């Protein structure tokens, strides 16, 4: 049966239902709509008219001009009853206010289908699904909230870029420390989490969120790959981390609380380094995945072969073109390409 998130989706902008509800709000009639009909719904239905017509936004609006409730079919394709009096079991507990809304939630609990109440006085839509409630929000308000989050995401993306460049400078110089790696890990997670918040707003916006989706995907583009690469470079396991190991590490990062993200030792635990403050100053050596990703045109398949062969970024910098053409799967052309691409990083920083 419909879940709370699924029901909100059925009422998202661009849907036939949401069009009808918008019409009801402008009409200021109020409404009480049951999204489903079975034996249990009929049990609580009293009086009213039985009708069999196709759903239409306009048809719903007119029917809700009448006292009572409108029942739709489970698939949502039809309007099955109108002018109904709901009589849910009064023992079902609810903290809502007034006959309409208390009747709505009780009916939602008893039948198991979503129930919608529209307040004529407040012009507010509430949907009740099995003890949970959600109040719809105008697309403008959601956009305002999401654009504030987009602004913060713009600030976190700039901050991530600068610390990442600092880490890249340290990797070339061979003066990286756990603290340097974990500063980037934190900034990667902050970008990810604020991105998840904006994503929920995109879902709630429905068709009104299409542009916000494009902007969000552009800003978040490459964040997943950066999280993978940093795990691949600085994971306490001696051998290069396994693919499942990488997925395990990222899952632990998501499991961290927001407060834990502000703890560099909490992040160090996830990567497998000691949790002591002293451990933050210990020197690390990158494997070279991040640097290789910065080389233009270099497919990750080839970089994985080189990183496993030489072990460390410093080994790759010291390697000759002939040293980089002795790895199976690395041709002469790619050995030259990586050789000049690495020596360009050495000079630049």
Go through the chain and tell me how many residues it has: 349
Q: Cα–Cα distance between 156 and 161 in angstroms, integer?
A: 9
Cα(60)–Cα(74) distance, rounded to whole angstroms?
Answer: 15
102 annotated binding-site participant: yes
Distance CA 128, CA 150 (A): 30
Is 18 known as a binding-site position?
no
Is residue 140 at the binding interface for a copy of itself, with CB under 8 A as the rule? yes
Closer residue to a copy of itself (CB): 123 or 242: 123
Residue 85 touches ligand 2BA, criterion: CB under 6 A:
yes
Residue 118, CB-side half-sphere exposure with 13 Å CA sphere: 28
Closest CA to 230 of 189, 267, 185, 165: 185
What whole-number distance in Å separates Cα of residue 191 and Cα of residue 5?
24
Handedness of CA 253, 257, 259, 265 (dihedral sign): negative
Q: Which of residues 179-218 bind a copy of itself (CB under 8 A)?
A: 208, 211-212, 214-215, 218
98 binds ligand 2BA (CB under 6 A): yes
What CA–CA distance (Å, rounded) separates 144 from 140? 6
Task: Please identify, using beta-carbon distances, which residue of 103 and 186 lies nearer to a copy of itself.
Answer: 103
Binding partner of residue 299 among ligand 2BA, a copy of itself, Cl ion, none, CB under 5 to 8 Å per kind?
none
Asked whether 313 and 286 are in contact (CB, 8 A), the reply is: yes
Measured CA to CA, the distance from residue 221 to residue 238 in angstroms comes to: 30
Q: Looking only at residues 54 through 113 of this chain, which bind Cl ion when binding is defined by CB under 5 A?
A: none
Which of 38/154 has CB closer to ligand 2BA?
38
Shortest distance in whole angstroms from residue 19 CB to a copy of itself = 11
Is 222 annotated as contributing to ligand binding? no
Binding-site string for a copy of itself from residue 294 to residue 333, where x marks contact by CB under 8 A and - marks none: ----------------------------------------
Map residues 39-68 to x or -, x wherever contact with a copy of itself holds by CB under 8 A.
Answer: -------xx-xxx-x--x-xx--xx-xxxx
Report if residue 151 touches a copy of itself, rule: CB under 8 A: yes
Q: Which residues are annotated as a binding site?
A: 68, 86, 99-103
- Using CB under 5 A as the criterion, which residues of the chain lie in contact with Cl ion when the complex forms? 22
């Amino acid at each position: 049966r419909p879940t709370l998130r699924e029901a909100v989706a059925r009422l998202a902008p661009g849907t036939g239902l949401r069009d009808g509800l918008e019409r009801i709000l402008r009409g200021r009639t109020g409404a009480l709509i049951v999204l489903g009909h079975d034996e249990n719904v009929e049990a609580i239905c009293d009086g009213g008219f039985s009708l069999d017509v196709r759903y239409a936004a306009t048809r719903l609006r007119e029917l809700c001009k009448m006292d009572g409730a409108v029942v739709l079919s489970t698939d949502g394709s039809r309007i099955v009853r109108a002018n109904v009096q709901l009589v849910p079991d009064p023992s079902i507990p609810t903290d809502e206010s007034g006959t309409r809304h208390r009747s709505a939630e009780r009916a939602a609990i008893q039948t198991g289908y979503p129930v919608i109440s529209v307040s004529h006085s407040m012009n507010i839509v509430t949907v009740y699904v099995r003890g949970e409630r959600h109040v719809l929000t105008d697309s403008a308000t959601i956009l305002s909230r999401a654009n504030q989050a987009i602004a913060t995401l713009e600030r976190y993306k700039t901050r991530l870029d600068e610390v990442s460049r600092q880490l890249s400078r340290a990797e070339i110089e061979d003066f990286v420390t756990l603290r340097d790696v974990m500063t980037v890990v934190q900034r990667l997670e902050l970008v990810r989490r604020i991105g998840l918040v904006i994503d929920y707003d995109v879902v709630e916006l429905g068709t009104d969120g299409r542009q916000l989706r494009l902007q969000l995907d552009e800003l978040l583009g490459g964040n997943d790959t950066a999280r993978e690469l940093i795990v691949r470079d600085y994971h306490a396991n001696p051998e290069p981390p396994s693919t499942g190991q990488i997925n395990a590490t990222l899952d632990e990062l998501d499991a961290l609380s927001d407060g834990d993200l502000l703890d560099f030792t909490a992040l160090a635990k996830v990567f497998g380094y000691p949790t002591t403050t002293e451990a933050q100053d210990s020197t690390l050596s990158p494997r070279g995945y991040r640097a290789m990703a910065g080389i233009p045109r270099l497919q990750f398949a080839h970089a994985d072969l080189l990183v496993r062969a030489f072990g460390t970024l410093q080994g790759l910098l010291a390697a000759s073109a002939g040293d980089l053409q002795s790895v199976d799967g690395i041709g002469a052309m790619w050995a030259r390409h990586v050789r000049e691409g690495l020596s360009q990083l050495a000079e630049s920083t």
